[PDB]
Structure 1
């Protein structure tokens, strides 16, 4: 575990930087695929994976990776905070400033975080007892990120995307 402050600060900025690099590469892969460049898409994705590897290394160096119930608890904390603190204020600030798109995207994320926080809480309870959770499917709306376990409604209750557009993890 890194213990010095400056080095801890730097590995944190690098952790942030590797996560933005991975996310940008994923967004790029998907644009490249869309524009008729599948091999560039393939390049962006594999480099994405390199960045996940660096980010993952910085994270462990920081001693921030625990066992699943502590991981779940970190996700609970992250999500609860975006729900109570970060998004409501970013959302109110976009609206205050007239930025309709920023209203849309922060509203999209806020409604999803509320769900994510509940799910991680319910999952920790089972994790806290040596047990896996029992689920078949998870649906994610690819417009807003609304998230539903096992049964999802026929349209996204956030943006109205039909259930056929949902991404399914099973």
Structure 2
């Protein structure tokens, strides 16, 4: 575990910076695939994984990687903050400032994020009993991030997208 303040701050910065590069490259990979450049998309995804390794290395160096129940709890805390504090305020500020796209993106998140913390809660209860959760698949709306395990609505409650649009994790 890194203990010195500046170095710790620097690793935290580098974690956020590699998180954002990894993310950009993922977003850029999708765009490349769409514009008909599949080897470029593969390039972005490979380098996106390189940045995952760097962020993960920094993360583990800060001592932030624990066992699954502890990791689920960091996630519960993170999700709670996003949905109880950050998105409600950001949404309100976008509305107050008349920023319509930002009203959209924060609105989607505000309605799509709630379930996360709940799902991590359940998971942690079963993982601390030394068991896995009993889930089959998870549906994610590609438009607004709406999230459902096992069963899902015929249309996304957030954006109206049909279930056939949903990304399935199984």
TM-score by length of 1: 0.99
The CA deviation string for residues 6-50 of structure 1, in whole angstroms up to 9 with x for no partner, is 000000000000000000000000000000100000100000000
Of the structure 1 ranges 72-81 and 108-117, higher mean CA displacement relative to structure 2 is found in 108-117
The CA deviation string for residues 95-153 of structure 1, in whole angstroms up to 9 with x for no partner, is 00000110100111121210101110111111110000001100000000000000000
CA distance in 2, matches of 1:39, 1:75: 34
The CA deviation string for residues 55-111 of structure 1, in whole angstroms up to 9 with x for no partner, is 000000000000000000000000001111100000000000000110100111121
Aligned-partner SS, 1:154: coil
CA distance in 2, matches of 1:77, 1:113: 13
CA distance in 1, matches of 2:127, 2:95: 39
The ranges of structure 1 where at least 4 consecutive aligned residues each deviate by more than 4 angstroms after the TM superposition are: none
Aligned-partner SS, 2:148: strand
Aligned-partner SS, 1:156: coil
TM-score by length of 2: 0.99
Gaps of 5+ in 1: none
Aligned-residue Cα RMSD (Å) equals: 0.5
Counterpart in the other structure of 1:163: 163
Aligned-partner SS, 1:144: coil
CA distance in 1, matches of 2:128, 2:160: 36
Aligned residues: 170
Gaps of 5+ in 2: none
